[PDB]
Amino acid sequence: SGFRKMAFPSGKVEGCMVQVTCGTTTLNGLWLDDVVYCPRHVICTSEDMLNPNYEDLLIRKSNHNFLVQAGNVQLRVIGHSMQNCVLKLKVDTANPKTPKYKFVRIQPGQTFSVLACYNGSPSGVYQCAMRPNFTIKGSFLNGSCGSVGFNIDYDCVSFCYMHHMELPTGVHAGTDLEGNFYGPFVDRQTAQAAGTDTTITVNVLAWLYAAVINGDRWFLNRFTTTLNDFNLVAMKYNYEPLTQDHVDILGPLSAQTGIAVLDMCASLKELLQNGMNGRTILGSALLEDEFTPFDVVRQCSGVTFQ
């Protein structure tokens, strides 16, 4: 038992991380087969990053302007192209460590692991959710751009996120691996702001199920509620609506615990209207919304990856 913010093992991704230097900008790239993916603002400099014209900037570049370091071995760039907000650097060597992979775009509410990297060297790994406002609450410093987020499904790495920038509230924005931003953000230094967030209701419920599975039952009650009556309360506390599909997805957790989904909603309702009164759930004094129903089943049942 126990419940932790758990990331996927990062080794398959670690073997893909390289260092990309162009001019005075160094960031991280993702090396799969004979292509290195990186944020296109690597072609920019300090005065470039105000309002840039990336197509203009890229035609002025040469293959030899891009220094790619795979550890202590330099990769010769033999081609380059822009795909939306990412650069594709064609290099003369296929990465022998290329895992089976996909490029998948995730939904707000879904989670993924981030391998934070500096100078092409992995620094740490942690779990993140895509917020309803298409930001992520990450941990990123200068030089972390190009770090990727990912999920693992048996042996296949589903890359979902590449890091590009930090917003003024300290949250982070980036693209999928095809270079399309999550949310209404651009890779320019303008006055962009996250925009209002909501709590991911289905995830809170999944985490309450994790708590019951782990022996925290104090918030359970005999009351119930209709889906519509619950959603009236969700709206008032800035929770997003619960759909019948969410109820269906919570079915296995409901069935393992014997607590009907709508009964657990009634519990969440009481937790929202009364707080927690000095108690904790799974070591938290807040309602946690960054575990999906998938995350809970995986951890409270023990799926591995090979």
Place this chain on the structure above:
Amino acid sequence: SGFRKMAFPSGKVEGCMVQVTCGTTTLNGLWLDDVVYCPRHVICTSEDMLNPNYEDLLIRKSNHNFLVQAGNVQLRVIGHSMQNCVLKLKVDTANPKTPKYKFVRIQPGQTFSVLACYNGSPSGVYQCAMRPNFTIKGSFLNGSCGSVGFNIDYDCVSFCYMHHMELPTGVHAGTDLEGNFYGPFVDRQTAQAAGTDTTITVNVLAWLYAAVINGDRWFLNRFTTTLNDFNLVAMKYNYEPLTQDHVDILGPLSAQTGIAVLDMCASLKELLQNGMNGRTILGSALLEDEFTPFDVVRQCSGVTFQ
């Protein structure tokens, strides 16, 4: 910016994990050079694990009783021996993926990453602290024994923990890699219990420094306190004493923020006596004690590993 429970990249450890089967027990082993390390209760069965005599049990075993699977490749055991609570399985192949490593025993208060494994296959990675009572609040299911905890220091993996068991309160106990338990626990199914814990005061302070670095300042104040007056309050709230050495270790964080350590103690004092009054710190409604001063500097400055 941002602050997350961050684990070390797990790839160097992933390449060491194997599956050890003996009789009807399967668990994880750690393969370094030509030795596989695993918990010695793998030689036990259901009626063996009540009150066993492991030396008696081991003389009755043969090399061929131990089936070691490194992925889809079986390792021939050519020798075996017991070192305290771990088995050392000598195999005929040195692990070509052996990183530079050490076996180090950590102190209560120190943190480490855990690579949770089932059937020799890594499942997830997360960060843990050694509690003052020598337990750890992990996430472990059946078959997770032999999963290791570790730190990384540039290129060298310092293995500090091997998982052995879960205690009735849902917390976990294990050994260092020389087979010596952390705390007063034995690898038998008796009525062992964790024993009372305390909050790791120096870590709470480090995390308050992380918060200031990240822009949470509401808990700061003009008051100060002597070390002795603070320790009178720590004792009352079950915090463990702060030493001058802790104050020295917090020096760099004090110097980066401009907040004297004893001023931050005065802040902690007020947080202990008044609670947080509906506010949060680094997204937490509790005082967090599983980040060391090292962890905070690493994350709020960006050290990598290669």
